Design a protein around this ligand. Structure first.
Ligand code: CLA
Ligand code: CLA
Ligand code: CLA
Ligand code: CLA
Ligand code: CLA
Ligand code: CLA
Ligand code: CLA
Ligand code: CLA
Ligand code: CLA
Ligand SMILES: CCCCCCCCCCCCCCCC(=O)OC[C@H](COP(=O)(O)OC[C@@H](O)CO)OC(=O)CCCCCCCCCCCCCCC
Lengths: 95, 41, 31, 80, 64, 163, 742, 34, 142
């Protein structure tokens, strides 16, 4: 037995021998009471993995960033504000 | 004196003596014959 | 003179076709 | 794992077996030298590639040769 | 006999030897039938590993 | 023969760990055991919802008070959208992690043995469908937490010291 | 029982072993088969543990080697005093210390090097020295070159005395092991008799020599007519007119009416306005107090009269629940291992030297030291480098002890064993803190770089941007500025002018010290310092803790302390030895100390050092640009490395041209180190084979076979040349810049 | 520039989305056991 | 020579725990178990870092790598003059006897041992890589 004596090797208990323990894995099943809404509203992500969630994320990131970069106003984004002062002009008269 | 002469004949001691003599010779030559770029002949 | 939007979209379509051909050549190199 | 080879130039000094940290080499009967033994590598799958066996061989060029490769779990010397 | 006489000066023909084209002294030659490299050669200068002796077969040693 | 607070991991001197007050204090151990990640009996979806809610809620703040538009009138909106984008990216991270790590139809490989040796059931979070449910719940909870933080901070404008 | 134990004539004084180079070791005593032997001869000469296993003989060698080092140091000091006596303008500098540059080295007119004899002032030409010896001799009360000559002659005599002492204690009367193991007696004697009595003697000198001469010097008296020290000792009425308390004459000392000595035993603090140094009355009282403290502390350990402490019993009594036996077995470690003692003492000496560097600029202890900016910078940088090297050496010798002198049987469940048993946690957390510090300091610098380059200066980390104020350091400065008011009521000034108060000491037209302000730049640079120190500590501590074994090589103790690798197996075991960890910790200490000295130089040239005008306007050497330019790496590149290097590169044709020459030469040596660091050994061995073929074709091949440097030797050469080049580059750059702008 | 909005469209894609998809696909590919 | 079986009632050395020990690899892939007989209670040094007391009799120690088993065994043999043997243990309960495959240490030549990897030529007599082009074999494999 693992704990009968100072022996720490046992083929009948290999999880104890190798240290495959769960230090903080509480298995109490009573945590929440009202959770019908959370199950109801989350159908696009759960039990989808690569098919629905990933495609939705790609589409809603590409479209979202495209819309934000195309519809941003001048004040919020400086690159789209454009130049306001006169050109500084370069040396040797080259422009 | 055999052992002292053997020690003085070792590579580092002889190198020190020989290079110091060479440096003194070159330094004295430059004292009497300085700043020459051309060998006069 | 400056290029037009029709030219821009023609270039984009040509690049898309070249990308299709590139993907095809990559798949041909793979196996 | 790595490939370990023994050559007929071996003199059966056993110095390569004693230097091996993973017990890959062993001495076997032989009739090509005065010592009447030769090194062998029956369990190279445990070889890590340290070539300590190579450093311990006294022949001009090595009678034991390690060629490396593969780099499996036992080869990389990983405890995790 | 097998190879060169004891104490004779022999030149090494092993290409992979540290002492290729170098002269050494024969120390001992073993007459046991089956030994592949019976000639023992001592050298004046060591190799990279620090060894100054080796074993050769008579066919890769020549007399000076 | 003294008290010797420090002990080996579960009494085994040959496992790579220790028993320290930081590790297994009654308070620290109780706190860690009731975190949603360690509630193995609870469905992965609800644990993911809680984790995402907490993480989006805490993530909203730094973006709002440090973003490039923190000196503008759209500071709150910019920070909230940045937090939502980070949540979405982390959702992709979780999805690809689950795809690479877990294969459909395999049993969970999580430790099913407690320190005492009760030999409980394996945690279903370490499964393909378990991780998929966890990722979906985390996405929903992250968006919900970002929205709630934005509402409390700006739509409702509760009085807070720093914001 | 503590007693004197020696052996008579253990070693015969003979030159026989001088002719045999490698006599000390069995391996090298055979002869030079290869050229590696020569290098080995110089790499194992002082490794006395490797020569033999006898601890008595090792202790005797160590004692005699220490005597030899003392003789060498005495020769060096005697040389400095001689060069002050003859080849110096010390007396001219005494007449005018604010306008004459110290110089004590004169070159010979041979190859145009005579240009290096610059016009330092006082009718003298020579190299401008920055060692601070002039100010030290001014503090000691030296007024003539005859006193420097007699000091130098005494130094030569003491060097000969130390040389003879080493010879006597090795070859004639060599102490036994019991003598060396009397650690309690050694501590008592070195605390009461070495430090306490030395401090008392120096206090006596100061009271009787330094104070009267220096106060006459501060009054403007020409040093020629200042009475000699023995005239102060003998004619005590002459000494009493400067400090009346001497008229009391040792009566207050024995009647315990010590307040009557307040004339020359003060607790003023701050700086002397005339000289810019510390008050010598404060220094005398300081040295007297620490002499008393050390003489008291040296009566703590039990030698043979009872009454005292057994350090073994002190250590064995200190253990707790979180540890095992605690400090059990450490007495044997520290009384039977020389390397453990060397590690402890090296670490303490390095930290102490760093303390000295930090404390000698904030409180300049010598007259006309603060206004000599070159001397201040040189002293700080020198002692910083010395301290860093000593700390890295402490790490090296801790690793050496762990490898060779560690005995598991006598070290079970004690502190060393338990540290070895959770080294994984230690190194994990140290790695995490190193990464966190590196990010949140250097990434802040990179953020500043990027926002400055993007035209977004309002998004930076500066005083005009997001501010990171060092509130804790500022609070400490505020507390220290108000210490005389409430916390140390018997103090006139604060500990230093750097804390605060609005007081500015300006000797001549320069600035000695002023309140140093701390802002975002100081926050950033201190966190950079913390990052570098933690990474160096990570490398060194990981080398020490994993010296004996690791998950990769569980038998690393059998491999030794100084070995190249274990092979290309397990993915590659390059640089697994603790020696290699020291080799990398040298690079990281180099970076740490380099950044520290750069920060010191820029901060002082920007915010402290400068010139004050008659009206009271203070201008600085750089212009106070540290607060806004040190926040950006481009600012360091431009406003410090590019702007302040304008003088070393334009020094040609002047007395500072040697600094430019050595600047470029140090660059060369660093680049040269790069190939020993980057290259391997097989390549060079094969190149040597080709060269040996070329020599053999002409029958000129040596019998001592040429070999490439070992891997460990390659690393050692690389790191040595790297450090030499970098440190000499900085040395030339600082010296040229600070001689030009000061 | 004929279409000023076209940079504002394309740069975000090739900058963030294309790397995201590329790295996700490559991570899924190199972690397959088969 | 009949290989011994790994007993599960062998006490372990007195050790206070260490961060260098069994990890997830021990429970997913493999670990090792070394056993030795000691005449008295003495302190030895753990190959993973630390010190322990070996039992006055049978001992049983779990390791993560074979190299650590060899290191501890070599120290035991050359220091305490103790015979040792270790096993490779798999998560499914499979135990494989490893070090003295035939009961005799590999340093001593023993009959019945087969020559594996022995080449009947000099090392310099290898075939050139060019001759073996496009052939999925190495020069040393011939
Ligand atoms: C080359 C590609 C690229 C591009 C196009 C951008 C674009 C941007 N970066 Mg930069 N960035 C890049 C590479 C890039 N980044 C890299 C390589 C680094 C690492 C060095 C950074 C580090 C960086 C920092 C540290 C910050 C930015 C910020 C920003 C934003 C500027 C502020 C703004 O829009 O207003 C304010 C922002 C908004 C109004 C909206 C932001 C949130 C939207 C909704 C994101 C889209 C999320 C979407 C669901 C997922 C799409 C991507 C997904 C498919 C992978 C802008 C979107 C700033 C910012 O705001 O971060 C969020 C900022 O603080 N970037
Ligand atoms: C002339 C007097 C004399 C004589 C004949 C000897 C003779 C001997 N001594 Mg003794 N010894 C002497 C004086 C003398 N010693 C003194 C004065 C000291 C005190 C330092 C010692 C301390 C001493 C120790 C501790 C040991 C010996 C040993 C020996 C033996 C071998 C020494 C040898 O060959 O190394 C010759 C070495 C040298 C010539 C190197 C000299 C290095 C000097 C000390 C330092 C110079 C530093 C230099 C200034 C800076 C260099 C860099 C610069 C160029 C930039 C031999 C019996 C050793 C022994 O018995 O072996 C077991 C031993 O362990 N001696
Ligand atoms: C230990 C520290 C130290 C250092 C670094 C120096 C450094 C220096 N000293 Mg000082 N000195 C010192 C201690 C020191 N000294 C001490 C303790 C004394 C008291 C004895 C002196 C007394 C002294 C005098 C009196 C003079 C110097 C001078 C010098 C300079 C030239 C050296 C010289 O003449 O060698 C020249 C080289 C040799 C003597 C070597 C000759 C032997 C070689 C190997 C060739 C032999 C070949 C063949 C065998 C014959 C140099 C800056 C000189 C100077 O600055 O002049 C302006 C000078 O005049 N020194
Ligand atoms: C390579 C070694 C090296 C070299 C070349 C120098 C060179 C120099 N040092 Mg530095 N130093 C070093 C190592 C070195 N130091 C180390 C390791 C320490 C730490 C102990 C110091 C601490 C130190 C101080 C505190 C001072 C110097 C000074 C000087 C200058 C010499 C002036 C002089 O003769 O006054 C000799 C020094 C004094 C007269 C004062 C020393 C006072 C200390 C407290 C006494 C030492 C006590 C004790 C013996 C040390 C061990 C303590 C330990 C047991 C706890 C010169 C720039 C002085 C300076 O800058 O003058 C301008 C100076 O004040 N050094
Ligand atoms: C009051 C007594 C006393 C004093 C002053 C010292 C002083 C010193 N000891 Mg210590 N020592 C003592 C008692 C004392 N020791 C005792 C009782 C033991 C045996 C337990 C030791 C064992 C010991 C060892 C093992 C070592 C020292 C070393 C040193 C020197 C370190 C270098 C330094 O910083 O010195 C700064 C001061 C100077 C350099 C001044 C010059 C030295 C003067 C002349 C004082 C010498 C005092 C001396 C002990 C008196 C006896 C000699 C007399 C017969 C002529 C230093 C000179 C180390 C050393 O360097 O050895 C040479 C060393 O390795 N000592
Ligand atoms: C080891 C250090 C040291 C030494 C050797 C001396 C030596 C001397 N002191 Mg000084 N003294 C010292 C430290 C020292 N003092 C310190 C630290 C203080 C401050 C408390 C004094 C305060 C002091 C006073 C106030 C007087 C002396 C006097 C004397 C002289 C006569 C007393 C004696 O014992 O002789 C003598 C030259 C007396 C003197 O000068 O008489 C001629 C005298 O009146 N000493
Ligand atoms: C109190 C100070 C002190 C003492 C007594 C020792 C004593 C010792 N050390 Mg430690 N060490 C120290 C400080 C000290 N060290 C410091 C500060 C460092 C950090 C750099 C080290 C780092 C260190 C390592 C990494 C090693 C030692 C070793 C040794 C042993 C010497 C064996 C050897 O090869 O030396 C013989 C002397 C040399 C090799 C010095 C040659 C000259 C050096 C390399 C370059 C000189 C630079 C010079 C200033 C450049 C300018 C001049 C140039 C232009 C000519 C001996 C036990 C070795 C050992 O014990 O191995 C088992 C070893 O491996 N030490
Ligand atoms: C400038 C050159 C440089 C840089 C940047 C580093 C960086 C680093 N070294 Mg190395 N090192 C160098 C030169 C350098 N080293 C040299 C020349 C030597 C020889 C002596 C060493 C020797 C050495 C050793 C021996 C050790 C390190 C360690 C470290 C780490 C410090 C802690 C850390 O990771 O967090 C700080 C990290 C940085 C400062 C790296 C830059 C990160 C910036 C600030 C942020 C950029 C990210 C940004 C978002 C862009 C994203 C890119 C994305 C778009 C792809 C880090 C990896 C130590 C380690 O392992 O870590 C604990 C360690 O033990 N180094
Ligand atoms: C290799 C050639 C090349 C390179 C380096 C660039 C580089 C760039 N383009 Mg241009 N572009 C190219 C060809 C190229 N372009 C061609 C052929 C077209 C016609 C369809 C365009 C049309 C185009 C538009 C309309 C815009 C850019 C823009 C940009 C910038 C942002 C990146 C981007 O959005 O790409 C978008 C690029 C495309 C849609 C073209 C498809 C990709 C081409 C065919 C190259 C792909 C293969 C190439 C060999 C790379 C191999 C990958 C790797 C192995 C190196 C950047 C300066 C943007 C800009 O100006 O921002 C300021 C922008 O709005 N590009
Ligand atoms: C948060 C950790 C605070 C530790 C505060 C602290 O100093 O703990 C002190 C803690 C108490 O041990 P004791 O001092 O009772 O042990 C007696 C000592 O005198 C023996 O050296 O020492 C340790 O357990 C080892 C170091 C702790 C681990 C340090 C990690 C940081």
């Amino acid at each position: 037995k693992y704990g009968e004596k100072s022996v720490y090797f046992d083929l009948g208990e290999i999880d104890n021998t190798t240290g495959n323990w769960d230090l903080y894995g509480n298995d109490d099943p009573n945590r929440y009471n009202g959770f019908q809404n959370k199950f109801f509203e989350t159908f696009a992500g759960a039990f989808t993995k690569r098919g629905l969630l990933l495609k939705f994320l790609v589409l809603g990131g590409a479209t979202t960033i495209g819309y934000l970069g195309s519809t941003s106003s001048g004040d919020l984004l400086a690159i789209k504000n454009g130049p306001k002062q006169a050109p500084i002009m370069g040396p040797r008269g080259r422009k | 004196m055999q052992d002292v002469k053997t020690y003085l004949s070792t590579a580092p001691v002889l190198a020190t003596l020989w290079f110091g003599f060479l440096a003194g010779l070159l330094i004295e030559i430059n004292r009497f014959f300085p700043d020459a770029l051309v060998l006069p002949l | 003179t400056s290029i037009s939007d029709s030219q821009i979209i023609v270039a984009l379509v040509s690049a898309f076709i070249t990308g299709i051909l590139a993907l095809r050549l990559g798949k041909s190199l793979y196996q | 794992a790595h490939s370990v080879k023994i050559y007929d130039t071996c003199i059966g000094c056993t110095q390569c077996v004693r230097a091996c940290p993973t017990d890959v080499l062993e001495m076997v009967p032989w009739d090509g030298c005065k010592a009447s033994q030769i090194a062998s590598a029956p369990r190279t799958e445990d070889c890590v590639g340290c070539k300590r066996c190579e450093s311990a061989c006294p022949t001009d060029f090595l009678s034991v040769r390690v060629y490396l490769g593969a780099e499996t779990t036992r080869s990389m010397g990983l405890a995790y | 006999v097998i190879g060169p006489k004891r104490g004779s000066i022999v030149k090494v023909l092993r290409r992979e030897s540290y002492w290729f084209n170098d002269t050494g002294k024969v120390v001992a030659v073993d007459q046991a039938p089956g030994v592949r490299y019976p000639v023992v050669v001592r050298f004046d200068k060591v190799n990279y590993a620090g060894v100054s002796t080796n074993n050769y077969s008579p066919d890769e040693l020549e007399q000076s | 023969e003294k008290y010797q607070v420090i002990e080996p991991l579960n009494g085994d001197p040959f496992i790579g760990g220790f028993e320290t007050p930081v590790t297994s204090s009654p308070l620290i151990a109780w706190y860690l055991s009731n975190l949603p990640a360690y509630r193995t009996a609870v469905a992965p979806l609800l644990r993911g919802v809680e984790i995402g809610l907490a993480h989006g809620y805490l993530l909203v703040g730094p973006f709002v008070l440090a973003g490039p538009l923190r000196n503008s009138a759209v500071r709150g909106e910019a920070g909230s959208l940045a937090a939502a984008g980070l949540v979405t990216i982390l959702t992709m991270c979780l999805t690809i992690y689950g795809i690479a790590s877990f294969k459909e139809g395999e049993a969970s490989k999580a430790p099913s043995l407690t320190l005492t040796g009760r030999q409980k059931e394996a945690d279903k979070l370490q499964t393909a469908e378990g991780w998929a449910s966890f990722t979906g719940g985390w996405f929903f909870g992250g968006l919900s937490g970002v929205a709630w933080a934005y509402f409390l901070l700006y739509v409702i404008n509760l009085p807070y010291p720093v914001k | 029982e503590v007693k004197i134990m020696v052996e008579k004539d253990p070693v015969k004084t003979s030159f026989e072993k001088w002719a045999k180079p490698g006599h000390f070791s069995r391996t090298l005593a055979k002869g030079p088969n290869t050229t590696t032997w020569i290098w080995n001869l110089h790499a194992d000469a002082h490794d006395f543990d490797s020569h033999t296993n006898d601890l008595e003989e090792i202790s005797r060698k160590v004692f005699s080697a220490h005597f030899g080092q003392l003789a060498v140091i005495f020769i060096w000091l005697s040389g400095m005093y001689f060069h002050g006596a003859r080849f110096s303008n010390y007396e001219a500098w005494l007449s005018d210390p604010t306008h004459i540059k110290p110089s004590a080295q004169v070159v010979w007119p041979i190859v145009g090097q005579k240009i290096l004899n610059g016009d330092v002032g006082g009718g003298f030409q020579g190299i401008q020295i920055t060692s601070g010896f002039f100010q030290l001799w001014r503090a000691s009360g030296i007024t003539s070159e005859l006193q420097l000559y007699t000091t130098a002659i005494g130094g030569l005599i003491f060097a000969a005395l130390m040389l003879f002492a080493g010879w006597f204690h090795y070859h004639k009367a060599a102490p036994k092991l019991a003598w060396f193991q009397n650690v309690e007696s050694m501590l008592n004697h070195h605390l009461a008799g070495l430090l306490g009595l030395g401090s008392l003697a120096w206090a006596g000198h100061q009271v009787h020599v330094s104070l009267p001469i220096n106060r006459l010097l501060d009054a403007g008296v020409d040093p020629k007519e200042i009475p000699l020290p023995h005239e102060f000792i003998l004619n005590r009425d002459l000494l009493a007119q400067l400090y009346p308390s001497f008229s009391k004459g040792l009566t207050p000392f024995f009647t315990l009416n010590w307040s009557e000595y307040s004339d020359f035993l003060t607790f003023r603090g701050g700086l002397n306005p005339v000289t810019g140094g510390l008050w010598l009355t404060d220094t005398a009282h300081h040295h007297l107090a620490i002499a008393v403290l050390f003489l008291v502390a040296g009566h703590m350990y039990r030698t043979n009269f009872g009454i005292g402490h057994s350090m073994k019993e002190i250590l064995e009594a200190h253990k707790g629940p979180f540890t095992g036996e605690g400090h059990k077995g450490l007495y044997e470690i520290l009384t039977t291992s020389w390397h453990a003692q060397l590690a402890i003492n090296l670490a303490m000496l390095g930290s102490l030297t760093i303390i000295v560097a930090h404390h000698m600029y904030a409180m300049p202890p010598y007259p006309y030291l603060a206004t000599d900016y070159a001397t201040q910078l040189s002293l700080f940088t020198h002692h910083m480098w010395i301290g860093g090297f000593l700390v890295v050496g402490a790490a090296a010798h801790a690793a050496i002890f762990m490898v060779r002198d560690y005995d598991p049987t006598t070290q079970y469940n004690n502190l060393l064993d338990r540290v070895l048993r959770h080294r994984d946690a230690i190194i994990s957390h140290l790695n995490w803190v190193c990464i966190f510090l590196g990010f949140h300091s250097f990434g802040l610098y990179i953020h500043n770089d990027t926002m400055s380059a993007l035209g977004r200066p309002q998004d930076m980390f500066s005083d005009t941007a997001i501010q990171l104020q060092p509130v804790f350091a500022q609070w400490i400065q505020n507390t220290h500025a108000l210490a005389p008011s409430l916390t140390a009521p018997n103090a006139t000034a604060s500990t230093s002018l750097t804390w605060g108060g609005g007081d500015l000491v300006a000797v001549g037209g320069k600035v000695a010290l002023l309140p140093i302000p701390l802002g975002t730049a100081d926050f950033l640079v201190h966190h950079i310092h913390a990052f570098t120190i933690h990474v160096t500590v990570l490398i060194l501590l990981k080398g020490v803790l994993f010296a004996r074994s690791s998950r990769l090589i569980p038998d690393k103790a059998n491999l030794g302390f100084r070995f190249p690798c274990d092979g290309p197996g397990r993915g590659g075991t390059c640089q697994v030895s603790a020696w290699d960890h020291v080799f990398l910790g040298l690079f990281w200490m180099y970076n740490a100390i380099s950044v520290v000295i750069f920060h010191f130089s820029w901060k002082m040239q920007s915010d402290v050092w400068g010139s004050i005008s008659d009206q009271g306007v203070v201008t600085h050497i750089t212009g106070g640009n540290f607060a806004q330019s040190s926040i950006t790496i481009n600012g360091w590149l431009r406003d410090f490395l590019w702007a302040q290097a304008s003088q070393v590169i334009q020094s040609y044709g002047s007395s500072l041209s040697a600094y430019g020459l050595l600047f470029l030469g140090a660059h060369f040596v660093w680049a040269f180190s790069l190939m020993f660091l980057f290259s391997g050994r097989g390549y060079w061995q094969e190149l040597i084979e080709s060269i040996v073929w070329a020599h053999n074709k002409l029958k000129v091949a040596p019998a001592i076979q040429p070999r490439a440097l070992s891997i460990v030797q390659g690393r050692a050469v690389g790191v040595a040349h790297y450090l030499l080049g970098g440190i000499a580059t900085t040395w030339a750059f600082f010296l040229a810049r600070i001689i030009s702008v000061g | 520039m004929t279409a000023s909005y076209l940079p504002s469209i394309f740069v975000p894609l090739i900058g963030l989305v294309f790397p995201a998809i590329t790295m996700a696909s490559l991570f899924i590919y190199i972690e397959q056991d088969e | 020579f009949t290989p011994p079986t790994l007993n599960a009632d062998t006490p372990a050395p007195i050790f206070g725990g260490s961060t260098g020990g069994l990890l997830r690899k021990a429970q997913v892939e493999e670990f090792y178990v070394i056993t030795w007989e000691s005449p008295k209670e003495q302190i030895f040094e753990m190959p993973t870092g630390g010190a322990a007391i070996m039992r006055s009799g049978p001992n049983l120690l779990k390791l993560a790598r074979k190299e650590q088993c060899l290191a501890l065994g070599a120290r035991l043999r050359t220091k305490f003059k103790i015979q040792y043997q270790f096993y490779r243990v798999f998560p499914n309960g499979e135990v494989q006897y490893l070090h003295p495959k035939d009961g005799v240490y590999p340093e001593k030549v023993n009959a019945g041992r087969t020559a594996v990897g022995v080449n009947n030529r000099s090392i310099g007599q290898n075939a050139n890589p060019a001759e073996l082009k496009f052939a999925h074999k190495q020069a040393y494999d011939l």
